[PDB]
Design a protein around this nucleic acid. Sequence first.
DNA 1: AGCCTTTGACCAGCG
DNA 2: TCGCTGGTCAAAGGC
Length: 61
Amino acid sequence: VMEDGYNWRKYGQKLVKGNEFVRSYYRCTHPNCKAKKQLERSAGGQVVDTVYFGEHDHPKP
DNA sequence: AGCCTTTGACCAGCG
DNA sequence: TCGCTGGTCAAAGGC
Ligand SMILES: [Zn+2]
């Protein structure tokens, strides 16, 4: 729910590390842009980490 | 209508 | 080999 200035579309969600956390997978909405992030929530909905892969081919919108 | 989640299937690296 | 764990796909539904 927090923002970092980019547009992400969610392409999956999975339970990990023995149903302890749940991980959400997003990729950047800008065309041809291969950047993906994932973010990983605690059982209480609190966000633990955020993982960024790659870089955008466009600047911040 | 055109974006967006959600959800289970699919699949691939690895133990 | 085999089954587990995680990453993605595609089909549906919501706003
Ligand atoms: Zn991008």
